[PDB]
Amino acid sequence: GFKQDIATLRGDLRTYAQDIFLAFLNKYPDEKRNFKNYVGKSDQELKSMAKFGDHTEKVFNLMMEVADRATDCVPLASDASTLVQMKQHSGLTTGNFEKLFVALVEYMRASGQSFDSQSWDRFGKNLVSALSSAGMK
C-alpha cells in the first residue's frame, strides 16, 4: 500500500525523483516556465545538471516525509502550512502540484510494480486541498 510505496521510493529515491519529475516536465512542457534553466535539454542532459538532481531529490525527500506523516493519505495541516510558507513556491498555483501528481500517478500505473496508485492520487488531491486551505492560490 501507500506506506510500503514510501519505502520503495526511498530505496532508490534519486532515480525515482528524477524520473517522476522528468515525466511531469515531459507531459506538461509549459511547466518549464517555472524552470528556465531546464529548457532545451534532453532528459539525459537534465540528469547532468547539479541543481536538477539535488533539487528533485530534496523535493521528494520532503514529499516522502509529508506522505509518512499522513493518515489515510491525508497530510498534516502543519506540513501544508510549511509548503505554503516557501519563498521558492511564491509563484505557484495548486494547479502546478496537481499536474505533478497526475504525472506521478501515471508513472506508477505504467511501472510493473504493485504501487498503490489510487492512494497516491488521493494523496495528491488531499495535499492540493490542504495547500488551498493553508492559502495557496
Ligand X SMILES: Oc1c(Cl)cc(Cl)cc1Cl
Q: Which residues are annotated as a binding site for heme b?
A: 36-37, 51, 55, 58, 88-89, 97
The Cα–Cα gap between 108 and 93 comes to 24
Q: How far is the CB of 38 from ligand X (least distance, A)?
A: 7
Contact 14, 55 (CB under 8 A): no
Q: Which of 59, 74, 102, 134 binds ligand HEM (CB under 6 A)?
A: 59
Contact 127, 80 (CB under 8 A): yes
Pattern of binders to ligand X over 108-137, x per CB under 6 A?
Answer: ------------------------------
**Contacts (CB under 6 A) with ligand HEM, residues 61-120:** 62-63, 83, 88-89, 92, 96-97, 100
Q: Quick one: DSSP state of residue 87? A: G
Non-local (6+) Cβ contacts of 135 within 8 A are 84
Residues that bind ligand X (CB under 6 A): 21, 35, 51-52, 55-56, 59
